[PDB]
Design an enzyme around this catalytic site. Structure first.
Site: not given
Ligand SMILES: [Zn+2]
Length: 365
Positions: A66, A180, A212-213, A235, A323
């Site tokens: 993503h 990510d 995607e998030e 991922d 994140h």
């Molecule tokens: Zn991810």
């Protein structure tokens, strides 16, 4: 000096793109992947789709990473020139204060810092309790709303973390923002790269989904556009090899191979496909680790519910500090994920895909 691989990973992680604002990332991924695709297109929300035909009427295999990274969006400019924002993607309040961010405005980039009320002004209790994200703000050195607007700031502007790509003393360890999921985008690219010089009895799609998030949104639209027969969501996964974590809480270790996800909140892995992948890893001598993500999901979650359904499996890279401004992952895991998916795809002809899908006969009908 960075080799070809690290240069690409740096370019991908350097790109700025939060949900709904993935263009810059799409442009970088497109430049890297088009040399290995017969056709490159996008869905209507911006997901990048690179098609590589190995066998004209062979089954369609979707490899999805993503493009979006977690970030923030400007929502308001205070009378005194401070910026209020909204988190776009899941953020933990405890990794945000005193962090440098970049606001991408119509007039260019603006550097700011995330702040809150000073500790001494808070109560001894509140000083121990995490600051609430809604009570945070971004300071760009403006002194009025008029000034901030003049500089180009406007509600809706993307706000992205700022961090410099760093190779650790053990060059296998890489520190950067957005692993990510720029690492997943990278996997899709390199798998197609490998397929350029090896036969595969199918049609492969290297995909960079959008949003995607915020709910596996681009995965849904991209999968509808493709109508895949098999799908691999690539991922990052959470690494459990840092201080304070027990195997019960997180069993994976960086450098021990890509993770074969047996279960996550968005999808129960397809057994037939999972077994085929595990068998390939064993036969090829590729290291791998099993894991499950109780409270998380991946693009596979949306993909497998497309039309009549899609046998799918998520393969992830155990990563530390997901994140946040700086995540860390291991290069061997990345390379082995590429090798594993490449080797599996070589075995996915129509016959094999039919049998993986229809388990009680008449599969080739
Ligand atoms: Zn991810």
């Amino acid at each position: 000096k960075l080799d070809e691989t690290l240069t690409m990973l740096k370019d991908l992680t350097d790109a700025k793109g939060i949900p709904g604002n993935e263009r810059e990332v799409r442009q970088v991924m497109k430049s890297y992947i088009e040399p290995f695709a017969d056709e490159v297109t996008t869905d209507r929300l911006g997901s990048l789709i690179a098609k590589k035909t190995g066998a004209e009427n062979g089954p369609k295999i979707m490899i999805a990473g993503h493009l979006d990274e977690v970030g923030f969006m400007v929502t308001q400019i205070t009378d005194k020139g401070f910026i209020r924002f909204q988190t776009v993607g899941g953020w933990w309040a405890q990794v945000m204060l005193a962090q440098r961010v970049t606001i991408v405005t119509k007039k260019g980039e603006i550097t700011g810092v995330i702040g809150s009320k000073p500790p001494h002004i808070l109560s001894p209790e509140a000083r121990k309790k995490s600051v609430e994200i809604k009570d945070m703000f971004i300071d760009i050195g403006a002194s009025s709303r008029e000034e901030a607007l003049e500089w180009g700031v406007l509600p809706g502007d993307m706000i992205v973390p700022h961090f410099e790509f760093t190779v650790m003393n053990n060059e296998k360890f890489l520190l950067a923002k957005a692993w990510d999921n720029r690492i997943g985008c990278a996997i899709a690219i390199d798998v197609l790269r490998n397929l350029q010089n090896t036969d595969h009895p199918n049609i492969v799609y290297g995909v960079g989904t959008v949003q995607e998030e915020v709910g596996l949104r681009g995965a849904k639209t991209a999968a509808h556009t493709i109508q895949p027969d098999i799908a691999f969501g690539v991922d990052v996964g959470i690494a459990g090899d840092t201080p304070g974590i027990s195997e019960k809480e997180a069993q994976s270790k960086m450098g021990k191979g890509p993770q074969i996800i047996v279960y996550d909140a968005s999808m129960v892995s397809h057994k037939g496909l999972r077994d085929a992948v595990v068998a390939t890893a064993e036969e090829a001598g590729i290291p791998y680790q099993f894991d499950a993500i109780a409270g998380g999901g991946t693009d596979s979650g949306a993909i497998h519910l497309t039309a009549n359904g899609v046998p799918a499996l998520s393969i992830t890279i155990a990563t530390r500090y997901i994140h946040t401004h700086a995540a860390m992952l291991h290069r061997d895991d990345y390379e082995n994920a590429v090798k594993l998916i490449t080797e599996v795809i070589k075995k996915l002809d129509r016959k094999t895909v039919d049998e993986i899908t229809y388990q009680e006969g008449g599969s080739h009908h």
